[PDB]
């Protein structure tokens, strides 16, 4: 797969960053209350809620306080795009101002969708190349262009024929 801007131990580093992820769940709105450490210690920011203009600086500041390597998971339609609130007081998406690694649709998403997003982030972390040290080697981060989850899951989704009727519980 393509990558966008001595080998076994790099894989071990990716494995350690993959299996050790300390999240910082930002509350924001109802997505966090569906889902229900300091930003210095956290390496994952889970933004789940409406990005209001009055606390977009709060999100930006708490993201800047985090330390590399850092990853962002955006839960719900508000954090992905603004959702149903295309309105004067709402920022239309988290990725307007901070980069997002995984997106989850929903309003709110289920908690096991958050677990699925954690699995996807673990794969993305395990298949990436980052500098080993700040004095030796290339100081560039190579994100891998993963195959999209809708192209990967297309066959089993299109193969669906019948569903249970909505007259039952």
């Amino acid at each position: 797969m393509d990558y966008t801007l001595m080998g076994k131990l790099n894989d071990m580093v990716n494995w350690g960053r993959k299996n050790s992820i300390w999240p910082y769940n930002f509350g924001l709105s109802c997505c966090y209350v569906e889902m229900v450490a300091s930003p210095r210690q956290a390496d994952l920011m889970v933004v789940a809620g409406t990005c209001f203009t009055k606390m977009a600086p709060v999100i930006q500041r708490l993201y800047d306080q985090m330390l590399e390597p850092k990853w962002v998971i955006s839960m719900g339609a508000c954090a992905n795009s603004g959702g149903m609130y295309d309105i004067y007081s709402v920022v239309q998406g988290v990725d307007k101002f901070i980069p997002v690694d995984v997106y989850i649709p929903g309003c709110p998403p289920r908690p096991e969708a958050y677990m699925q997003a954690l699995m996807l982030l673990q794969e993305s972390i395990g298949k990436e190349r980052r500098p080993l040290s700040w004095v030796v080697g290339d100081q560039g981060v190579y994100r891998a262009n993963m195959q999209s989850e809708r192209e990967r899951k297309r066959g089993e989704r299109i193969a669906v024929t019948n569903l249970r009727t909505p007259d039952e519980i």
Binding site: S81, D86, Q92, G93
Partner: protein, 905 residues
């Protein structure tokens, strides 16, 4: 008159019926078979109200409000329970046989039947039996036929036959198997058949051109615009979706084109959606074609234009007033040339002089319907100015209107009017080189060469007023028919003289001016109408400039080494060999245009101008009315690399880069101020529409309806990030629904008609002061000039009779509503409707040549031999040959020219 509706007192017009009087008051009565332009017939039985004898009456009686006069002291109830139950029952009876078709029906969301079903509150079906079904017909490329959806309201036949004068649509059958259509499959033959898609309250007659690329009404982006396909200036609402122009709706203008368009304006819009249009500036370097953005195109053009000694500019009657003015400012006043030929310019300037100096009032298109006798000289109105022909048909039916009014029959009781006035009609005298479509209602048709038509006009003017120059050599039978014309015109209270520049004869315009002056001197309330060729022919005539021949002379002599051609193909106004030679000699050609023309192969730079859909501007009517057209959509919203600016914007920024080496993308109001400051006879165009700072209680005017969908998905395949809403700095309209389109808003520019409960074209009732009247706060548009205090003198240049000289063939112009206009004949749906190119011959001339009907003859014009199949024309005269103007290879400038070497190929 005073009426009492539900205990509330209203003051109405007593000459109205109750339906139109109550709809004018804002009351909602359901109706199908009534139309404001068609009258009342009482078919659908939907408009029932309860009329009481007096104030102290409670029983009452159900009456049809469309058939009941709004007399003084009337007492009615709309919300009476019996009336509401009966109206719901009528809707239910219509619903019994209606197909389950709304998702796959083009009328959905725009359907009067849907609106009236919801308005009566009928939503529960208890009919359990079968539905009658019908076969459909093929009605041609424009109208799609779906007979299942018919509610038998008879609006189509009343419009098409009684109003429009068509003959091939009718009602067939009986009890509940009534069928509305043609006697057999075939194209509907009326030039105004396209108004059936708004006349029909259901989805029987639908816009087939729109149906190919269908979208719902709530998804359209609309703008108020002016039709660009002839000089009548009918108000239109073009609506677009996904970056392409989807539909042309009628925009109600009570002064011009009230409810109706012609088929050219309604269906010839398809050239806007052509894929060969220039979408980005292109500079030819060697054999390569480098694509530029706006900035470096302006810089390179300014550098090359600064290095040249003299720059000339060639305008067009297609372009707006602002575009031609911007070209005139860029090249200078003395270097600006109107893009039309010398004879065309002479006829156009004479028509302008007659209109604004002849002392005779020129009527608006709606006012044409109130004249008592019509003389049409040389102008094939139905093929060149079609809506004038429709208005002339109404003016002719005015005699039956007067006869019925003499028997105290109400104005709206149309069936009684047509029964009283059986075949009596106001006099119509048409003159042409052959038969016209107005001959069915014409009192007399004169088929003659344009010299003889002019001589007939001069003879009529002399017989009305002996001070006019006389005509020598009139035959006694022609003299008797002239006397019939003179008796009909002299007895008319409001005679109307219609002529125009399409005959290719200056003398026809002079004769029409003489007839109008002679009738003015007798005290008649005479009006005169001039039909020009193009959308802004009158504006280009007012602005003035040299002819195209002078510009080609400047290019060929080498006095001009740079030419800027604005929206002109130059082959319709001059010979193509001369134009190609002059443009090949010039070391710099810059073509500012929105259509891929044949002169762009010689062009060093092509500026991708916008069409009427993507531009704002002002165009001048054939009656001298300045009208704004507003931009429908931003072309760069979907394709980000599209650089398609207004022509005045291109030329103003080019002038600014020529002077101060900085681009200046100006504003429309600035250019309009420049026009009204420099050209004082175009000063009326400032008042055509309010400027860009106009607001309705602080908000702009919406281009799209409130329920516009796909706001976060229509561009999502390009990018999931929703782009910036395009900002309109030129006009008061916004490229969003965040704006006002209220029916009670104090404005005259209405992009589209929608009211809650009224989704169909019947929503225009809410936007009018009275139904069928004007718009509530005035119709848009302003007359540039008033009637002159003193008129002209008589034109003494009476031409001689036509003489067929051997070897020469006078070209008689034949115009086609589908084909003669340039941009509309570029539209793909016109190609099926376009007649095959036939060269028309007299039987005697074809017998002299030995030529039969259908064999191909070759003729040479300007040293160019072209071949056409022969059609025999009995109405044509000997020594004349008939040619279809504006088709492929036959320029309209050929009208009146002679022909050489006509022989069988």
């Amino acid at each position: 008159a005073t009426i009492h509706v539900d205990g509330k007192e209203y003051e109405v017009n007593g000459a109205d019926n109750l339906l139109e009087a109550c709809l004018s008051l804002g009351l909602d009565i359901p109706y199908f078979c009534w139309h404001p332009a068609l009258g009342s017939v009482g078919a659908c039985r939907q408009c029932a109200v309860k009329q009481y004898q007096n104030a102290e009456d409670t029983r009452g009686r159900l009456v049809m409000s469309c058939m009941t006069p709004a007399s003084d002291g009337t007492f009615i109830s709309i919300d009476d329970e019996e009336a509401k139950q009966f109206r719901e029952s009528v809707v239910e009876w219509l619903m019994t046989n209606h197909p389950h078709d709304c998702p796959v029906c083009e009328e959905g969301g725009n359907c009067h039947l849907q609106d009236m079903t919801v308005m009566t509150g009928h939503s529960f079906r208890r009919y359990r039996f079968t539905k009658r079904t019908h076969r459909n017909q093929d009605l041609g490329p424009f109208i799609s036929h779906e007979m299942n959806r018919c509610i038998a309201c008879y609006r189509c036949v009343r419009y098409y036959k009684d109003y429009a004068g068509g003959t091939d649509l009718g009602v067939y059958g009986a009890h509940d198997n009534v069928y509305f259509g043609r006697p057999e499959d075939g194209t509907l033959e009326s030039e105004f058949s396209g108004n059936l898609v708004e006349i029909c309250p259901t989805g029987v007659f639908t816009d087939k051109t729109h149906s190919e690329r269908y979208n719902r009404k709530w998804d359209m982006q609309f703008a108020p615009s002016i039709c660009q396909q002839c000089s009548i200036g009918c108000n239109i609402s073009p609506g677009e979706r996904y970056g392409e122009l989807r539909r042309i709706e009628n925009r109600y203008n009570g002064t011009v084109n009230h409810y109706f368009l012609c088929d050219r304006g309604r269906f010839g819009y398809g050239y806007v959606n052509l894929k060969d249009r220039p979408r980005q500036p292109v500079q030819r370097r060697g054999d390569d074609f480098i694509t530029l953005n706006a900035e470096q195109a302006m810089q390179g053009a300014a550098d090359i234009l600064r290095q040249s000694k003299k720059v000339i500019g060639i305008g067009s009657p297609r372009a707006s007033v602002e575009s031609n003015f911007a070209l005139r400012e860029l090249v200078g006043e003395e270097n600006f040339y109107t893009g039309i030929a010398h004879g065309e310019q002479e006829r156009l300037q004479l028509a302008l002089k007659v209109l604004r100096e002849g002392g005779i009032y020129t009527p608006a298109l709606r006012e044409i319907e109130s004249y008592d006798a019509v003389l049409v000289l040389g102008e094939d109105v139905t093929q060149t100015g079609a809506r004038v022909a429709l208005a002339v048909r109404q003016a002719v039916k005015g005699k039956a209107r007067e006869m019925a009014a003499a028997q105290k029959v109400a104005d709206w009781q149309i069936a009684a009017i047509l029964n009283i006035g059986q075949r009596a009609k106001h006099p119509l005298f048409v003159t042409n080189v052959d038969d016209t479509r107005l001959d069915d209602i014409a009192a007399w048709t004169y088929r003659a060469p344009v010299e003889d038509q002019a001589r007939l006009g001069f003879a009529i003017a002399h017989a009305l007023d002996n001070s006019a120059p006389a005509v020598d050599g009139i035959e006694p039978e022609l003299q008797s028919k002239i006397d019939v014309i003179v008796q009909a015109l002299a007895g008319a209270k409001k005679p109307l003289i219609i002529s125009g520049t399409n005959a290719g004869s200056l003398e026809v315009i002079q004769a029409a001016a003489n007839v109008a002056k002679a009738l003015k001197g007798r005290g008649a309330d005479v009006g005169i109408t001039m039909i020009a060729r193009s959308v802004n022919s009158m504006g280009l005539g007012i602005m003035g400039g040299g002819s195209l021949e002078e510009a080609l002379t400047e290019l060929e002599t080498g006095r001009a080494d740079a030419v800027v051609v604005l929206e002109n193909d130059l082959h319709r106004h001059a010979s193509a060999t001369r134009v190609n030679a002059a443009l090949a000699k010039a070391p710099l050609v810059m073509v500012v245009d929105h259509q891929r023309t044949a002169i762009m192969e010689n062009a060093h730079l092509v500026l991708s101008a916008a069409s009427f859909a993507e531009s704002d501007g002002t165009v001048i009517n054939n009656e001298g009315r300045a009208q704004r057209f507003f931009q429908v959509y931003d072309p760069a919203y979907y394709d980000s690399k599209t650089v398609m600016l207004e022509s005045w914007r291109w030329l103003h920024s080019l002038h600014s880069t020529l002077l101060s080496r900085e681009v200046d993308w100006t504003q429309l109001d600035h250019v309009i101020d420049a026009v009204v400051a420099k050209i004082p006879e175009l000063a009326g165009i400032k008042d055509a529409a309010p400027d860009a700072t106009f607001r309705i209680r602080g908000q702009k005017l919406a281009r799209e309806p409130h329920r516009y969908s796909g706001r976060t998905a229509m561009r999502a395949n390009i990018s999931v990030h929703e782009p910036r809403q395009p900002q309109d700095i030129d006009t008061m309209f916004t490229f969003s629904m965040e704006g006002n389109n209220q029916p009670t808003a104090h404005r005259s520019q209405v992009p589209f008609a929608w009211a809650p409960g009224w989704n169909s074209p019947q929503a225009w009732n809410k936007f009018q002061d009275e139904v069928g009247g004007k718009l509530r706060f005035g119709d848009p548009g302003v007359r540039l000039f008033e009637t002159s205090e003193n008129g002209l003198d008589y034109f003494t240049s009476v031409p001689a009779r036509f003489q067929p000289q051997d070897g020469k063939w006078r070209i008689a112009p034949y115009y086609h509503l589908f084909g003669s206009d340039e941009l509309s004949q570029r539209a793909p749906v016109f190609q099926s409707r376009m007649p095959q190119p036939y060269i028309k011959l007299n039987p005697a001339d074809a017998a002299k040549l030995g030529v039969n009907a259908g064999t191909r003859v070759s003729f040479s014009y300007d040293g160019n031999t072209v071949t056409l199949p022969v059609e025999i024309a009995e109405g044509l005269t000997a020594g004349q040959v008939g040619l279809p103007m504006g088709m492929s290879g036959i320029a309209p400038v050929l009208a009146g020219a002679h022909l050489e070497d006509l022989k069988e190929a």
